[PDB]
């Protein structure tokens, strides 16, 4: 999958005798648009190099999500650290009703009607963590049928 999306660029500094040493951290999400998505982080002395290291990290550990034809399966609620996330499927007309890191993750992954909200802290990194921890864990039908046959479960 190849669609970039740069969620955040941040500047950090560590103290040494004489002064400060600066570095840049880039958080990015990479996916194809049909259910493959990953996120990556990259820190470097310069903004560009940070972005490319983030992209290389994002292309690795890229996972597969089973979406319901440009829509989520069912309303889901996930968390990471102090960040909590709620998403639920929407109709065909609705766009992506989300904010920030959630919108990047969802528009990269492939969904288009998400109607989502986030509670608690709004750190982009932790919000991306929560959003994947939610998307990755959906089941889809004929997999909840890990109990018995189908059409007798829905």
């Amino acid at each position: 999958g190849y669609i970039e999306k740069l969620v955040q660029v941040n500047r950090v500094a560590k103290t040494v005798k004489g002064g400060r040493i600066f570095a840049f951290t880039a958080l990015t999400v990479v996916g194809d648009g049909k259910g493959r998505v990953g996120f990556g982080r990259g820190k470097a002395r310069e903004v560009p190099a940070a972005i490319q290291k983030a992209m290389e990290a994002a292309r690795r550990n890229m996972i597969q999500v089973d979406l319901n034809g440009t829509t989520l399966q069912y309303p889901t609620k996930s968390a990471h650290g102090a960040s909590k996330v709620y998403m639920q499927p929407a109709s065909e007309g609705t766009g992506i009703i989300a904010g920030g890191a959630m919108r990047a993750v969802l528009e990269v992954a492939g969904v288009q009607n998400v109607l989502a909200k986030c509670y608690g802290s709004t750190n982009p990194v932790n919000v991306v963590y929560a959003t994947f921890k939610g998307l990755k864990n959906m089941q889809a039908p004929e997999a909840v049928a890990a109990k018995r046959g189908k059409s007798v479960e829905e």
Binding site: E92, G93, G95, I96, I97, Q112
Partner: protein, 205 residues
């Protein structure tokens, strides 16, 4: 109201098609239409998401010449209408009377089409309509006055629009200077470059 001013400074700022002239010579060799205006013009100026929404909303408003109170009323009506409001807004905004008398081939520019429609020179079923906002129901035979059929401006606009494409849903008889609308246009009919979803994202905030 209406907008008065340069009609290609806008194109230079936006940097896209933005039909605002008769199209006699070209779109380019008038204003070097690739740079934003003013002293600070060469800079591309990478712009954030809010920039994207503002830029395309201004794009649609300027191409269709609608003010923002009217535009937001149009958007509210589209949101009220069922079935994927994003294209409902375009379908409803297309049915304006001035844009129809333009796209029917009776006017050189949207501004000249408004000029004609305001001064009471066009009919719908013979009844004087001079509001450049009338929403034309499908079926009505939009036509120019039998008195006005001999004006040469309509002739020049018609021969200029003779080579601009075919929409393949209207039925137009050109000898008598009349139009006819059968059914509302589909989403695929209009230029499928500018997306409708980003507008509804703008107005959902």
């Amino acid at each position: 109201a209406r907008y008065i001013g340069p009609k290609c400074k806008l194109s230079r700022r936006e940097g896209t098609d933005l039909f605002l002239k008769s199209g006699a010579r070209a779109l380019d060799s008038k204003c070097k239409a690739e740079n934003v205006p003013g002293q600070h013009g060469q800079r591309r100026g990478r712009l954030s998401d809010y920039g994207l929404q503002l830029r395309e909303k201004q794009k649609v408003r300027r191409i269709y010449g609608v003010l923002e109170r009217q535009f937001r009323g149009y958007y509210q009506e589209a949101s009220r209408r069922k079935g994927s409001t994003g294209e409902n807004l375009l379908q409803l905004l297309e049915c304006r009377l001035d844009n129809v008398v333009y796209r029917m081939g009776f006017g050189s520019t949207r501004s000249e089409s408004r000029q004609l429609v305001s001064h009471k020179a066009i009919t719908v079923n013979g009844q004087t309509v001079n509001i450049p906002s009338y929403q034309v129901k499908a079926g009505d035979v939009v036509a120019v006055r039998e008195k006005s059929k001999n004006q040469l401006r309509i002739a020049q606009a018609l021969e200029l629009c003779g080579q601009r494409g075919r929409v393949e849903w209207v039925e137009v008889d050109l000898d008598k200077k009349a139009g006819t609308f059968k059914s509302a246009p589909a989403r695929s009919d209009l230029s499928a470059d500018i997306n409708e979803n980003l507008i509804v994202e703008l107005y959902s905030k």
